[PDB]
Amino acid sequence: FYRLKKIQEKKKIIKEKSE
Amino acid sequence: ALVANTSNMPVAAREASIYTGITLSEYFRDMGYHVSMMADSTSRWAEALREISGRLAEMPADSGYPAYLGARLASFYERAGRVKCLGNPEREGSVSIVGAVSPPGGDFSDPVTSATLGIVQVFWGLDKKLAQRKHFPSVNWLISYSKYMRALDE
Amino acid sequence: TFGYVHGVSGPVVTACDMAGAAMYELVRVGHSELVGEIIRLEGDMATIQVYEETSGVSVGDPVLRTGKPLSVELGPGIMGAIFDGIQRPLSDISSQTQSIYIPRGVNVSALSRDIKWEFIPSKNLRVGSHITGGDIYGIVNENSLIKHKIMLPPRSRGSVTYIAPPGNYDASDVVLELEFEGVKEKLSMVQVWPVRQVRPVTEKLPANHPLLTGQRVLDALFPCVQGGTTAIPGAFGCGKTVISQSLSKYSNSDVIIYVGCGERGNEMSEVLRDFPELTMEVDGKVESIMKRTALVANTSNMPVAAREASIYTGITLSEYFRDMGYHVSMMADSTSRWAEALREISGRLAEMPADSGYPAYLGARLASFYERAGRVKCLGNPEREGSVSIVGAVSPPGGDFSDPVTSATLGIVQVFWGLDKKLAQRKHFPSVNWLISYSKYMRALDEYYDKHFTEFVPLRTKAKEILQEEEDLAEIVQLVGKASLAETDKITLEVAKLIKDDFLQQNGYTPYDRFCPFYKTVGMLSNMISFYDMARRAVETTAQSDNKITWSIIREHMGEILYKLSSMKFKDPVKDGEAKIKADYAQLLEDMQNAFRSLE
Amino acid sequence: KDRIEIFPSRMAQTIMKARLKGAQTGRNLLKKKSDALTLRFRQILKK
Amino acid sequence: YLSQPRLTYKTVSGVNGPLVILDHVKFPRYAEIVHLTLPDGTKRSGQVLEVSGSKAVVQVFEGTSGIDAKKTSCEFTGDILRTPVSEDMLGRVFNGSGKPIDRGPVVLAEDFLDIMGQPINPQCRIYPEEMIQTGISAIDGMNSIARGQKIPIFSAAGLPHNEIAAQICRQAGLVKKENFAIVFAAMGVNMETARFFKSDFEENGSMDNVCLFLNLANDPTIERIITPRLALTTAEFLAYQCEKHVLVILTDMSSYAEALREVSAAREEVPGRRGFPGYMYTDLATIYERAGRVEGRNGSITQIPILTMPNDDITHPIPDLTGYITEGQIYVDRQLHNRQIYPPINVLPSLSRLMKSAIGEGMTRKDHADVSNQLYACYAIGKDVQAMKAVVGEEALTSDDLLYLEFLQKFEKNFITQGPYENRTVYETLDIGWQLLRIFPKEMLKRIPQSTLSEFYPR
Amino acid sequence: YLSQPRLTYKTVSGVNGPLVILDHVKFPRYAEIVHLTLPDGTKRSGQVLEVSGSKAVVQVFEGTSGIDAKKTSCEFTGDILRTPVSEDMLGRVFNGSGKPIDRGPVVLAEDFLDIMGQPINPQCRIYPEEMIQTGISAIDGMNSIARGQKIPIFSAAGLPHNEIAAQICRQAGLVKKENFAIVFAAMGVNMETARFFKSDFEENGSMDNVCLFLNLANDPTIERIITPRLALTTAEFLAYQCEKHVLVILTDMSSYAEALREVSAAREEVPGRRGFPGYMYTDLATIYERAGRVEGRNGSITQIPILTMPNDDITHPIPDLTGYITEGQIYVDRQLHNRQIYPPINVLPSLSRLMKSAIGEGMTRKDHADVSNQLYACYAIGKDVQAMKAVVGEEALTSDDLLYLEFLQKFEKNFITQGPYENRTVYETLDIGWQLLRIFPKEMLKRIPQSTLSEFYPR
Numbered sequence A: 001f002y003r004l005k006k007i008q009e010k011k012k013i014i015k016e017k018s019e
Numbered sequence B: 001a002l003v004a005n006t007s008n009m010p011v012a013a014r015e016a017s018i019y020t021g022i023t024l025s026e027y028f029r030d031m032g033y034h035v036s037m038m039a040d041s042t043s044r045w046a047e048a049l050r051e052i053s054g055r056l057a058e059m060p061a062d063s064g065y066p067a068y069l070g071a072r073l074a075s076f077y078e079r080a081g082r083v084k085c086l087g088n089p090e091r092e093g094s095v096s097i098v099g100a101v102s103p104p105g106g107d108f109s110d111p112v113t114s115a116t117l118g119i120v121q122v123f124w125g126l127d128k129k130l131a132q133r134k135h136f137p138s139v140n141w142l143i144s145y146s147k148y149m150r151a152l153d154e
Numbered sequence C: 001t002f003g004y005v006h007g008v009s010g011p012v013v014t015a016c017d018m019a020g021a022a023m024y025e026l027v028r029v030g031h032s033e034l035v036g037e038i039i040r041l042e043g044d045m046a047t048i049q050v051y052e053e054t055s056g057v058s059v060g061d062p063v064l065r066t067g068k069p070l071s072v073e074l075g076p077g078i079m080g081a082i083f084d085g086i087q088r089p090l091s092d093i094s095s096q097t098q099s100i101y102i103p104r105g106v107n108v109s110a111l112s113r114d115i116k117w118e119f120i121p122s123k124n125l126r127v128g129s130h131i132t133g134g135d136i137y138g139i140v141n142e143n144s145l146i147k148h149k150i151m152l153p154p155r156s157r158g159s160v161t162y163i164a165p166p167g168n169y170d171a172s173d174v175v176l177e178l179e180f181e182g183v184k185e186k187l188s189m190v191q192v193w194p195v196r197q198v199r200p201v202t203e204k205l206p207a208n209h210p211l212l213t214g215q216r217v218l219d220a221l222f223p224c225v226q227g228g229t230t231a232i233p234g235a236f237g238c239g240k241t242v243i244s245q246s247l248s249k250y251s252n253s254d255v256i257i258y259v260g261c262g263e264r265g266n267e268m269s270e271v272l273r274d275f276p277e278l279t280m281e282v283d284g285k286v287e288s289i290m291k292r293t294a295l296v297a298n299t300s301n302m303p304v305a306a307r308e309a310s311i312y313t314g315i316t317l318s319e320y321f322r323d324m325g326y327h328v329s330m331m332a333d334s335t336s337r338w339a340e341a342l343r344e345i346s347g348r349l350a351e352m353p354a355d356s357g358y359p360a361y362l363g364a365r366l367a368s369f370y371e372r373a374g375r376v377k378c379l380g381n382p383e384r385e386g387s388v389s390i391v392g393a394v395s396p397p398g399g400d401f402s403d404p405v406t407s408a409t410l411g412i413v414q415v416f417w418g419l420d421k422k423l424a425q426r427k428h429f430p431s432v433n434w435l436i437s438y439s440k441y442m443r444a445l446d447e448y449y450d451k452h453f454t455e456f457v458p459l460r461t462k463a464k465e466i467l468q469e470e471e472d473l474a475e476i477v478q479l480v481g482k483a484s485l486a487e488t489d490k491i492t493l494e495v496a497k498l499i500k501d502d503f504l505q506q507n508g509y510t511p512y513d514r515f516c517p518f519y520k521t522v523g524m525l526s527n528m529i530s531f532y533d534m535a536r537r538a539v540e541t542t543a544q545s546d547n548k549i550t551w552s553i554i555r556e557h558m559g560e561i562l563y564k565l566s567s568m569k570f571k572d573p574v575k576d577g578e579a580k581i582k583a584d585y586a587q588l589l590e591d592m593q594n595a596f597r598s599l600e
Numbered sequence D: 001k002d003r004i005e006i007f008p009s010r011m012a013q014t015i016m017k018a019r020l021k022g023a024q025t026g027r028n029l030l031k032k033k034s035d036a037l038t039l040r041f042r043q044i045l046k047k
Numbered sequence E, F: 001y002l003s004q005p006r007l008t009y010k011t012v013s014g015v016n017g018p019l020v021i022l023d024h025v026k027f028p029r030y031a032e033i034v035h036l037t038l039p040d041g042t043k044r045s046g047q048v049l050e051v052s053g054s055k056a057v058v059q060v061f062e063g064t065s066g067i068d069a070k071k072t073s074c075e076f077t078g079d080i081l082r083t084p085v086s087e088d089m090l091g092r093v094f095n096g097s098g099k100p101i102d103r104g105p106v107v108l109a110e111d112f113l114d115i116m117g118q119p120i121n122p123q124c125r126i127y128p129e130e131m132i133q134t135g136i137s138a139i140d141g142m143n144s145i146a147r148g149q150k151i152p153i154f155s156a157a158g159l160p161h162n163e164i165a166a167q168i169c170r171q172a173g174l175v176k177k178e179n180f181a182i183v184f185a186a187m188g189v190n191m192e193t194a195r196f197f198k199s200d201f202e203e204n205g206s207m208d209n210v211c212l213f214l215n216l217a218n219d220p221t222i223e224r225i226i227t228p229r230l231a232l233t234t235a236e237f238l239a240y241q242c243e244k245h246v247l248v249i250l251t252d253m254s255s256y257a258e259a260l261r262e263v264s265a266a267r268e269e270v271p272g273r274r275g276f277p278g279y280m281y282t283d284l285a286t287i288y289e290r291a292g293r294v295e296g297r298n299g300s301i302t303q304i305p306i307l308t309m310p311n312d313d314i315t316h317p318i319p320d321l322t323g324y325i326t327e328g329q330i331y332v333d334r335q336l337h338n339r340q341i342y343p344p345i346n347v348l349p350s351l352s353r354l355m356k357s358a359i360g361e362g363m364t365r366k367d368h369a370d371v372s373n374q375l376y377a378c379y380a381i382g383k384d385v386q387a388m389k390a391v392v393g394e395e396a397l398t399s400d401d402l403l404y405l406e407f408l409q410k411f412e413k414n415f416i417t418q419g420p421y422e423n424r425t426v427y428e429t430l431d432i433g434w435q436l437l438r439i440f441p442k443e444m445l446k447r448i449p450q451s452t453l454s455e456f457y458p459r
């Protein structure tokens, strides 16, 4: 669970950087 | 006619091998022939799906497998059966599918074993203790089932 | 030459305007100049691991970039001193600040520059002589136990241009001047070596000599060697700190480096108080133990990042003495606290974790740490031989030997001294399981044992067979109720108890079990095994006759022998020397042999 | 000792649950054997 | 001191769980305290747990319910939570935040100390060499307490661990044959527990030397992880600056661990076991290691971090990590309580990691260590006999086994059972030990040398 | 001939663990190789893991310590790590990256091969048949090894798997009615083990045909990712171009898997079971399957990789995925080791896929297949009898159960137990098998046809 949650948050962070 | 794909082949071909095989199977099915398709392993196919699901950074489900593993297995397993073929000749063929779930253990919580059991009509489980005793063929005779009894009773 | 702090997340500080900074360079963060080390570089921003509490650090604080990496000062003045996790001497801080608390941002030289060292050159060098790395060009008498060899640092070489005459010099003077290719180098008594780099040796050799431990078990059954690596993954209360401290007190090593990495503060004080009161005669003269030991304190309530520096500082010090021809047996009493520090930092770094939250590279750090142990041929013309042993504790949660640290450790170390909490609850100390432990150096030392003892090896084998047979029986006896046991099996069960209670356990806080000289361990084992063989033969030759010597018959006939056998531990080797102990053990063996003659 | 020492797994859950059911069934069947022997013993005691 | 005016911000960027994120902050300081006012006038406080550029993350102690985004007003104190301390805090009752709740005034400080404290230089730390007489044979005999030692009581919900701690507060003296200042941190407990201790302290007539910190079950869960430091901060002032011997008792540390776990989850930190932070050990050491004597000063701090073991699981991270840090534990269980044995202290899984040096010639009596070790052997074997007898039956036992069953039965009712107001000396405890040991013949007392048996056993 | 000057960049974007991230790179090539020159002159190499736009992520083999983000120079080779290979690499010792460590010269590039491997057409693959007579009864009798097979040795920490592998190497050969070249890849191996194998090869005079690649436990952990690819690349050259028979030993695929995990975590890849990359299966298959024979050649590659099993289990992802790829295993156990049995090989969980075809009339003995099966079943039953005896006692077994218990004890003592310096032939192994089978009356040997029994059983 921990690793998957951080993966989802990192994906959102990458998406914010692209905007 | 065999389709050859080894464990050291690219994961994308490892996934597509099953689709190629069943495509050839249906092709001959539409000729009115009775086709019997043997799989070496569906755990290797599921393994390819797990590897690609990871590489695509999509959200996994149980034990790292994609949540849609069951949908892919249903797509493969439901492409079979006695049919009335298309075409003027009114011919009727069939495809039988024999799957193969490599057992990490006798626990059918295994995502691949569990999804297969909910789909396949006949399950020929192989007992570990009979194998250890060199009793061959090794069939549990208690956990196996076949749902075609009433169909064959006639 | 400065950057600026960008953000703080705890033990990890982010800094900007540090484009030219390299990994593992030291920095000074904040107006107190806190010591830290760069972990990551992201553009012109650096990720800094800070070895001191970051409370009060503000955004915009300066960060000084220091070209030198985390390093240790090596020279005279180490022995007898206690250091913190980054080699700041605690006796010099307490003597200078007059405080009881360790201030943050303290910049104190690792080795005092006021002491006038007694230096004598080798008398074999001349101007124009060619000297290479590891060469010894003089000795400093730190004390009466350890002769401190002044080595030419590794990665340095050249011709001698000047050597200081014998006399009194401090650590700020120049002792040796050498030149290589135009470039001249001036050396004092203190050299600097990056703590994360392994000091080079001529050849790593097999370990073929016992590391003497003041224990019956952990020596007779599971030997350790000079240069070997062992782990003690005991649960809390198992007594692994006592095993480590006992080994430090009573061993055949020349220098002990004791690393308290995450240990309770009371344990480091216990060493500082007790050690000065211990004795070890050198050449007819009584001397204290502390003159041949050094210790590093990085207690549990200190900065967590400093736990990594403590572990590497300890082994780096060990190698330095190894290079001088001494046998070093360093021990870090935690390991898990180091891996814990890695987990906490990895979290702040937002790294992807591996098994149970630990960094994926945990195994990489442990492997490279333990491989710095070993018996070596030293670099340097004088042809020294040394060793570093590592005796590392591990703290598995719950006593479950399944965590990534215990698992990874067991794949690295060659001796496994597993402890059983259920033995500690019974005060069966040391709480050694003796069923899951092993030592891969048994074959290596067989040559040693044959040369000096011979009798030891067949006794070791018989003792293991008895203990294993007892365990095989206990599994079923609990279910049967001792109803189906043969007379030969009852002998195994009762002698095995004899071994367990009197041989494998010893009270390390007594005048008689505080140290167990090897000759005593094998002596009293010989009697216990000799009893086994005589008792087993007595029944085997009579069970088929018209009177079988069952346990109840031998027990009543020889009840005095069974008590004497249990008393054999109470020999006090300091009051009663070797001659009395051997004579006493020999007499008990004769008494037993006579009892059997009258019995059978 | 305290555990059978089988590494944690879903496979271990299935084996342990089946092993537990077996042990409980054996306990009850042996208890019935004991009760039958006790009645005859007591009847034999009176005889 | 801090002479510059403080700044007030209305720049809250957003709120996520217990964390209020501010932007546009001038030179944010790490681990500084922020006071904030809600639109309705409510005042709350929090600490900056992260700074980055112009942003700062404030953890609010009272909570984030009702925190606005436009009207919220925050001010930065410019320092870390330094708290007022004075000697005359003894006799006062405080809440979990350090504020008075006894209708008295605020603290008139003698100084301001950093709640985080400082580690004591191990070179100046002096090893404990004094024994405290608890009056409980189960402790004074087999698990002695030193002055400066860290000994929590491991307990379980429903067991009288609060009564044992209360008893210890009254009848804890010295074996030198003395007034301890008690700091009692009541955190994560109900009113009745806090009132029980408060009343007992007055009943004992010792309230003039008792400082209370209350943080009840209905109080915020974030304050529950500073209250221990507030208690210890006072203890450090008293012990190391005023040379007062202080006894610091922290109530169920498990409420601390749970409050800590809540913060770890809120900040998405790397878990270890059972969801607790991977740094739980380091945080516990920060609390526990504020104890012990310091060379050259006549004060001391003794800790008793009592904790409840979740589901009686001795391997739960809370008792596990504590067991690794503290000098052993007392440990009570339900098997003794369910038989109306008081105190219900089970010696077998217990230990005191300073006992070996705090007993013997010059401390208590020379046979102390020998009596303790043999009693442990006899008690553990008696338990082994019951484990066997439960299956094989009493008729399957021999005289070698019945001796340990007799010992075990007489041991628990004569040695362990005392009563809430039974105060025995350490010398009487050892004499009792011998009364139990004399159940066995000399040949079976294999943990005791003949140099001791020959003197004491004959009586 | 790529006669095009190489570009060198200082446009370092950042460094994160073992990974160096570069920017402003012209047409990055995937899996290219970059030579790094550190500010102090140190040279190191790394391989590109991914490219995107003008950015590239480089995996640094020797380590990243000391690399800055301003001065480090990065030279792109323009090609894939094709390594020099030569037939005269035998009699040499290389480090984990293929460089001399034996004071010899750099291998002269007789040719270059892409270490990634060139897939072999299954149509031209030749099925292995000939038996290798290893000398070890546990292998030659039951789980026989064919030349061209893939049979790793599993073990846990502390077991003598290094001794078994060494024994096979010096005792290797064919069943007769001339020898192997050795390619030995050490990945994360300690110095004591490295000297064990190096000395054993020298003491037996084998070094004339041995090529060592040593990546020791104290060497870089990223480098070992290519080490196994360099070893097999040499094996493929020697076996398929130089008509040699090559036996390839991989000292630990578990330290290899850890190296992959370290990289996978560093690049924030989505893991599978226990944190390992989801592509572990593929990465192992591309190494394990570099074995067997090909049409038109006389040489072959036989692999016997070694894997340390974490926590003594066999469900860990590393041995789990390997089991799906390789053709059986040996599986060195611990229960046999604790009993001082060598080789401590457990025959029940270990299988050899090619065994059914590599034995029998025309290859070994008519009865080989029947003897193996009967011995296996008898051993398996004996273990089930032992499992029962542990509960009901030796007094609750019937006559047949005692026969299986007698077999079990004598089987391990006379058949499995051998010693490291004694070799037995496949025919001698079967004769011993019969001695164990003749413990039973012929009526109980239900897995052997009557014809086989009549020929051999009464002898």
Ligand SMILES: Nc1ncnc2c1ncn2[C@@H]1O[C@H](COP(=O)(O)OP(=O)(O)O)[C@@H](O)[C@H]1O
Pocket (backbone or CB within 6 Å): C234, C235, C236, C237, C238, C239, C240, C241, C242, C243, C429, C430, C506, C507, C508, C509, E324, E351, E352, E353, E354, E355, E356
């Ligand atoms: N070898 C031993 N001999 C005698 N007493 C011991 C021994 N080992 C442990 N003890 C006792 O048990 C206690 C627990 O040992 P300690 O080292 O503190 O445990 P840990 O395994 O947590 O480090 C010691 O303080 C001491 O009282």
Ligand SMILES: [Mg+2]
Pocket (backbone or CB within 6 Å): C241
């Ligand atoms: Mg400890």
